[PDB]
Amino acid sequence: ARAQALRIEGQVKVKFDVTPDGRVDNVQILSAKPANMFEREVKNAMRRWRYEPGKPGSGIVVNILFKINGTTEI
Amino acid sequence: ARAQALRIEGQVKVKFDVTPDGRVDNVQILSAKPANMFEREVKNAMRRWRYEPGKPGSGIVVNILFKINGTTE
Ligand SMILES: [Br-]
Ligand SMILES: [Br-]
Ligand SMILES: [Br-]
Ligand SMILES: [Br-]
């Protein structure tokens, strides 16, 4: 019943080629972080979630709607 | 080189317990998309980036600053 929020800040390096049309090619992520960053960060964020006390339950399923906004660093 | 932006939209289901103090425990993500969803989606979003034509290069490195904003449905 209580909605919860996800707010995760991060950075990720990418390496790629640029072709004569100005498009990227041969892209690889440079994961600095131990793989599977997104799922770890989501679980970590869920540590801040709080629900009503004295109402425990098990096997609760929630659907998280998210948007990722990013920009290249200048 | 030109700055670029990225926007990814998505959903992820998670399953967990709620303890007497109202905190979550025993969390598992219910992957329904293939693993490495984030990395795949970043690369797919880069398909929209455009740099100056006639100026190819290889091994270009850029850092993407991002924020993930989510809400339970
Ligand atoms: Br925390
Ligand atoms: Br609640
Ligand atoms: Br450029
Ligand atoms: Br597209």
Side-chain angles (χ1 to χ4, degrees):
Chain A
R2 227 160 116 179
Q4 304 286 345
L6 282 188
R7 301 262 178 56
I8 301 170
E9 195 198 303
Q11 331 167 61
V12 63
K13 283 184 263 176
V14 300
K15 190 160 186 181
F16 55 95
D17 303 337
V18 178
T19 39
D21 57 6
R23 296 189 59 186
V24 310
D25 202 2
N26 301 314
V27 187
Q28 292 296 335
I29 286 131
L30 310 183
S31 16
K33 312 202 108 184
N36 188 321
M37 186 265 185
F38 174 82
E39 291 196 353
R40 167 164 76 260
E41 295 274 23
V42 167
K43 293 165 180 187
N44 173 250
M46 291 171 66
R47 293 169 67 223
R48 296 193 278 279
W49 289 8
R50 293 291 185 282
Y51 291 95
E52 186 210 322
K55 305 219 176 154
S58 81
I60 293 130
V61 178
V62 318
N63 190 38
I64 306 173
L65 298 168
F66 64 84
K67 302 110 247 294
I68 307 172
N69 293 303
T71 57
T72 54
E73 186 171 0
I74 298 204
Chain B
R2 269 185 212 168
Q4 313 284 340
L6 159 172
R7 162 78 152 207
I8 296 162
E9 296 174 21
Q11 310 169 58
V12 55
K13 280 186 271 168
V14 306
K15 191 169 192 174
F16 57 93
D17 300 342
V18 173
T19 65
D21 50 310
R23 294 174 209 127
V24 312
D25 194 10
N26 293 320
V27 181
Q28 292 295 335
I29 300 210
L30 309 182
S31 318
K33 279 253 196 120
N36 316 143
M37 171 258 171
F38 175 84
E39 282 192 2
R40 173 182 89 245
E41 291 270 27
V42 168
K43 290 190 254 173
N44 164 261
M46 290 168 60
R47 288 174 67 237
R48 294 193 269 288
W49 291 6
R50 296 292 189 275
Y51 290 97
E52 192 186 328
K55 178 169 199 172
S58 74
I60 297 124
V61 175
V62 312
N63 188 39
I64 303 171
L65 310 176
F66 63 86
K67 181 145 137 166
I68 307 167
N69 291 278
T71 69
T72 59
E73 196 187 345

